[PDB]
Amino acid sequence: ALFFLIPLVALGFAAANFAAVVRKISSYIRSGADSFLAHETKAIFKVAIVIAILLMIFTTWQTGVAFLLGAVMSASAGIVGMKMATRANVRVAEAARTTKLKVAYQGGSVMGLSVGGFALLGLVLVYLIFGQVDNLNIYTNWLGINFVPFAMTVSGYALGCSIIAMFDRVGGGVYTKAADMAADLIADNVGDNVGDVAGLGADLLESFVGAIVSSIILASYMFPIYVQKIGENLVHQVPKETIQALISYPIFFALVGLGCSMLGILYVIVKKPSDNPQRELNISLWTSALLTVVLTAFLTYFYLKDLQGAISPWFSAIIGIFSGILIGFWAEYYTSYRYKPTQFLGKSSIEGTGMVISNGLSLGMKSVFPPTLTLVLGILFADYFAGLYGVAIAALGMLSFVATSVSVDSYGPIADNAGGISEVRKITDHLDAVGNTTAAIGKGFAIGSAIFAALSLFASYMFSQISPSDIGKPPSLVLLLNMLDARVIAGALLGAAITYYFSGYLISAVTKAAMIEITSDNALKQMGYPAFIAILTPLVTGFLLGAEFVGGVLIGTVLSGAMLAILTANSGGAWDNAKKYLEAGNLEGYGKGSEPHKALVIGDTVGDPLKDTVGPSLDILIKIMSVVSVIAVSIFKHVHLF
Amino acid sequence: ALFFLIPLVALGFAAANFAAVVRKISSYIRSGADSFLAHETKAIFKVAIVIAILLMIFTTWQTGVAFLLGAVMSASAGIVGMKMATRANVRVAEAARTTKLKVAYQGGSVMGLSVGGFALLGLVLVYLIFGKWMGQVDNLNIYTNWLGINFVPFAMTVSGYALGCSIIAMFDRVGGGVYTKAADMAADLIADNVGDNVGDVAGLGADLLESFVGAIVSSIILASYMFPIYVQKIGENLVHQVPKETIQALISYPIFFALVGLGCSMLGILYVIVKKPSDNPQRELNISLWTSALLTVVLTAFLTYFYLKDLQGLDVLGFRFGAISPWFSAIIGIFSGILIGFWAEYYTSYRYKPTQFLGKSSIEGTGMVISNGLSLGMKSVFPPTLTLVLGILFADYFAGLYGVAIAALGMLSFVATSVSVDSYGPIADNAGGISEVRKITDHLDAVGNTTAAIGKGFAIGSAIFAALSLFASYMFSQISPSDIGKPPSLVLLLNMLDARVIAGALLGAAITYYFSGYLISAVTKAAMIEITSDNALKQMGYPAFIAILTPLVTGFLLGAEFVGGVLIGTVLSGAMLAILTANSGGAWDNAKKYLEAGNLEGYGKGSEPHKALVIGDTVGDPLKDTVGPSLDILIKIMSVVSVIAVSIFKHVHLF
Ligand SMILES: [K+]
Ligand SMILES: [K+]
Ligand SMILES: [Mg+2]
Ligand SMILES: [Mg+2]
Ligand SMILES: [Mg+2]
Ligand SMILES: [Mg+2]
Ligand SMILES: [Mg+2]
Ligand SMILES: [Mg+2]
Ligand SMILES: [Mg+2]
Ligand SMILES: [Mg+2]
């Protein structure tokens, strides 16, 4: 029971860290937020109820309620983190004076702690409140969706969080980068929080919950899959207990996690103070992960000790953790002037706007390989030491310290805004540089986790066809999406193309809308397209062509989004800090007019729509499209047309 | 036999069209060419012999020789097309004076006709001398090589040939495409006017040669394979459920088809050209193309019936409707292809929308030209993909995997005109650089940039359509001696849920973004004749290694499931990216031209509006003329290498 009250503590904790801080005429920003949020919430209102009724009508109301649980939960989490981000933010210029810092990071930390507390309050609710883990045969609902009691329930929850986040980003990411563009051409200072706090935070909430939900669905499934069949009895070769312990474990694991991170957060703010905030963020991160690996290993033994080895998914969490951390490092590497990507680009500023662009492209494109490689090497090990389930738990390891990742992330625009506000500027610009890096690190973890998560959720997808009319065949006959089949290839091409389209549209959206209520109303009103594209595609294409084709689309979608999130994040990422870098002069005889500053400006402005809107949008698409397909293939495995 | 002397005629024909034309101090450019070609040929020399000995040692010398046949063949084709491109080119300024055109297109047409004649002379040779004399289409069983590669007699031979053409095309591109766009940058910061031929004539030309032959070789490998796959296993004898005569007709058919093709195109070139001349060259090129395609559809239909009329087991092959089947495939691929061309035009020419909108955003601040250009090309990727998505299925529904390869050929059963129109562009374009009358010349330039983008577009499409046949063959080629029983359906089963394949796919995608980043950087380093040529070649290995050893490195590390993955990632990403760069590269140049032509009131090639478009053309140049098209090459050469070496690493992988 203690474990079940653990998530509750994080939240009293969220409320406490801002308060000790908030007690620390630039209010201006808070008004911006309410307006967009007003308009946004109303569209959200309109939509969430409706999706809920839909799920309730078409799948199994338990799931629709859980779905609402997720909508209230994520909206709320984001809202709290926003009051903080928008208060440390103000309170930073004033930290920044007496100091010739605690503020920026504590504000960022409020959204992250709130994110953990809420997401888990909600999930614990879904777990307790939703005999589906008792039943876990293979129920075949009021229509013909033959749904998973529990899988279906938490899938509903995860879809809820993912969808409201995507909306928050594709509108807010849009309001924001549309704003940055507009500003360097005011609007922007609000943009920094809408964009890299609320939106980025929502993206991460989504990957995290998605990976955990996938762990849950899989357990909820070794059951119909492994059943014996020696001479026409069904013998459950995997007995219920093992499955139940394996279901509850990622939950228990996730509880063990956030806890490790909460210490990191309470530790660094109140910790005796440093003078360099990059090392803090990375150390805190590192710490949360060591701490988490060990205790997680205990949790794993005892809470899985004798099921019928034990520790295995703990190795999965570890492989994922170290992979995740490496990917963070890679993101820092590619985004911070101080090492290589930005410095070269930056100095090339002096050679003619063209070079900043072409080199920024080369930089992000090449920069794409190492995080993917970590993931390639990362998947295999996550995967070798455990079943499919070990991969999903691994996604979780990448994200096992989400509280600190998100804290550090929200630090950026929060620190970043602190910068814009004085214009003292040096302290402020450092804060800004780090915003751009730490938001790029964050993006990097969530993309990694999107891929690691995506393979369990995809496996779950082929698995979901395990209709009543299956419950015989070997697992090895059912988990077999064949790539040589033309439907899968066509599917893949279409999904990939869907991904490039989705990005181009999101780009175009940024520029149209860019050139509070005008663009907020416009962003939302003008928001349906990405959500339709993202969501109905499995449905449209699925209902058109069946399980092989949606399996394909999902594959293309995942591959492309994986590559592109990173391109935009890192390269879009380097350009801001390249601009800052030259703005700080650093090139001798160069400093804020002149052909190079102008060129770096062009880099930051080019980067801004890609990194803060497109890539991260792909983060979301590759999940929400898969979850939708996992559910609707219930219908289109059988019901496809041709 | 008539058919076997058909390819020969195209070539006497190549030599004739330039001559009637060439008889039509700006020589300057010819010197540029020799220098790069000198340096290039020497590195090529060094490498081709070596790859040949390698293949001969490790696979089956028949293949290594065939491979050399392809190296001499493609080098040569490209060289001839180059003397022409570089003579019509000069002879265009002078067409361009008296006309206040026949030149630009006839020059472009020389390389294309040479491409067809050579590629097919070579292939006919490989078919007769390797397919027939050495009986590889006769033995056709599954021979197992002095080492342990269990090679396909014929598949292996022609696979070698395809690899040869692919490799040398890639080399011609990754250096020359680099010299040329490195040059374009350097120029708008002279050198560039030479760049235009090196880049969009020879390089683009070699890309298309590669896609074309790759598609045909794949048709041949598959036929040369329904036999071991489809044997029965009835109560333990092997009964060739697909008999020799079927396979053999199905093998010869793409060849016979290709012969019927190119023939259809040659008519197109002589026809548009010799009409009393028109006034708009876009409508011509697209018409000529269009015509070659009507013609090809029909006659190919006859060819298909009689030369396939009674095969039997064409069903099992995947031929849902007998004899005519691959003709429907060729048709499907053709119309998909033509649409993809149209889409390319659509997205690249000021006059419609992608470039028009981009161009006018020039007045809003260079940032915008760049953003809108990314949006334009990125969105612009879909219709050509969707045409392919819808296109694969129909190519594929009406015929087996073989029908798909024949479909790739259909997208490309009209390459001669494609290559004519492509080569027209830099040739017309140079005509443009020269005089500087500029309006007459600039039009030719606009068209160079579009037609190079259409060309690119067909070749990328065909690369995907082709890629599924060559990939199928890949899973099939593991069909070791220890198989020759199980259902085809148990062997054509690359599993995506296997973590190895996913890691593979991600690795291939990642290898491809990397490949692109390196070629981009190469363009700027080298950009800022001999200096950059030597530098391009010397400094050229990296992409070829990456492209080629990856199946080998990764394959030998992780096995068939992983290289299958890498190949998948690589195909998917390169497909998307070739289009991004091509269509953008396509839009920005013509957006620049467009504003340069003024067309915005109160702007006359001055200020931010022209400056901004300049930035767009210069951004586009490295992407479209070097990166995308490079991906065109990578997605093939990496697959062919894997198809061959999986001979070893299906068994020999490490972990
Ligand atoms: K950022
Ligand atoms: K072009
Ligand atoms: Mg700015
Ligand atoms: Mg900012
Ligand atoms: Mg600012
Ligand atoms: Mg920025
Ligand atoms: Mg130029
Ligand atoms: Mg030129
Ligand atoms: Mg040119
Ligand atoms: Mg150009």
Side-chain angles (χ1 to χ4, degrees), chain A residues 5 43 146 151 173 186 190 213 241 253 282 298 326 331 338 353 361 406 416 444 476 522 535 567 603:
Chain A
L5 308 85
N146 54 227
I186 303 163
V190 327
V213 166
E241 276 194 57
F253 190 107
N282 292 39
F298 297 165
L326 283 23
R338 184 185 221 168
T353 303
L361 254 30
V406 167
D416 179 284
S476 66
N522 177 260
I535 285 338
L567 253 177

Side-chain angles (χ1 to χ4, degrees), chain B residues 288-308 310-319 321-435 440-485 487-550:
Chain B
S288 142
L289 278 167
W290 267 40
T291 301
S292 285
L294 179 58
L295 206 151
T296 285
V297 166
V298 68
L299 276 154
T300 36
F302 294 169
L303 166 295
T304 301
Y305 266 77
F306 295 118
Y307 288 66
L308 307 174
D310 323 281
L311 260 334
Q312 295 139 41
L314 267 182
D315 42 306
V316 196
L317 239 286
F319 281 18
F321 46 97
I324 195 55
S325 306
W327 175 79
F328 287 117
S329 293
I331 277 193
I332 287 293
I334 283 168
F335 296 140
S336 305
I338 285 154
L339 282 32
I340 298 174
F342 290 167
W343 286 115
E345 178 171 350
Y346 181 20
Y347 286 109
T348 56
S349 78
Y350 73 77
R351 185 170 191 187
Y352 296 115
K353 133 130 179 177
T355 284
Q356 221 71 85
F357 183 82
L358 187 68
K360 291 191 236 81
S361 67
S362 52
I363 74 155
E364 304 295 327
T366 304
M368 287 238 328
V369 299
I370 308 297
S371 247
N372 285 334
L374 255 33
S375 173
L376 171 167
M378 227 173 251
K379 285 175 44 165
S380 153
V381 153
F382 189 81
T385 302
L386 212 211
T387 311
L388 287 183
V389 165
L390 287 181
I392 286 47
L393 306 189
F394 288 133
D396 171 85
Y397 170 79
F398 287 118
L401 259 325
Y402 185 78
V404 170
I406 300 292
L409 173 55
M411 185 166 292
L412 267 28
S413 151
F414 74 104
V415 61
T417 301
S418 293
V419 170
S420 299
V421 177
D422 292 349
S423 163
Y424 156 96
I427 216 169
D429 178 284
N430 230 344
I434 287 163
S435 54
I440 325 185
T441 246
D442 300 332
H443 187 12
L444 291 182
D445 191 359
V447 181
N449 295 97
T450 46
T451 58
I454 303 175
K456 284 198 170 62
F458 272 78
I460 306 159
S462 172
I464 294 104
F465 237 106
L468 286 183
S469 177
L470 280 161
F471 170 72
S473 287
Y474 170 78
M475 292 304 300
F476 182 100
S477 293
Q478 299 177 5
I479 209 171
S480 298
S482 65
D483 300 73
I484 63 199
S489 67
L490 214 145
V491 177
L492 272 34
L493 160 311
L494 211 222
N495 190 3
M496 261 288 161
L497 229 65
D498 181 48
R500 293 223 177 181
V501 197
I502 280 299
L506 276 164
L507 213 231
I511 279 134
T512 299
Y513 268 7
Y514 188 85
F515 182 91
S516 300
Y518 169 53
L519 285 188
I520 239 180
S521 99
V523 174
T524 53
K525 263 168 277 145
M528 293 213 48
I529 304 183
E530 308 193 24
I531 301 137
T532 63
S533 296
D534 180 40
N535 176 261
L537 301 160
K538 250 75 267 151
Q539 192 72 8
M540 202 215 318
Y542 241 96
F545 163 103
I546 300 170
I548 286 339
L549 283 49
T550 303

Side-chain angles (χ1 to χ4, degrees), chain B residues 240-259 261-265 267-268 274 277-290:
Chain B
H240 285 276
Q241 208 173 225
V242 187
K244 259 192 200 187
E245 281 196 55
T246 301
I247 294 172
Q248 286 166 358
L250 290 182
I251 286 182
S252 68
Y253 169 70
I255 306 131
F256 289 127
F257 190 107
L259 291 168
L262 56 41
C264 291
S265 50
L267 295 169
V274 163
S278 336
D279 313 11
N280 176 354
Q282 205 97 312
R283 280 282 199 276
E284 294 97 308
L285 284 56
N286 290 45
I287 276 47
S288 142
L289 278 167
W290 267 40

Side-chain angles (χ1 to χ4, degrees), chain A residues 180 184 188-189 192 416-417 419-421 432 579-580:
Chain A
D180 193 342
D184 296 332
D188 204 11
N189 291 62
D192 284 336
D416 179 284
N417 235 344
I421 286 157
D432 192 1
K579 158 160 129 307
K580 292 317 164 181

Side-chain angles (χ1 to χ4, degrees), chain A residues 67 108 126 129 212 251 330 362 376 443 462 486 493 527 625:
Chain A
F67 166 84
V126 170
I129 299 147
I212 300 163
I251 292 121
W330 287 117
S362 174
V376 167
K443 286 184 171 72
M462 295 303 302
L493 276 173
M527 202 215 319
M625 195 186 301

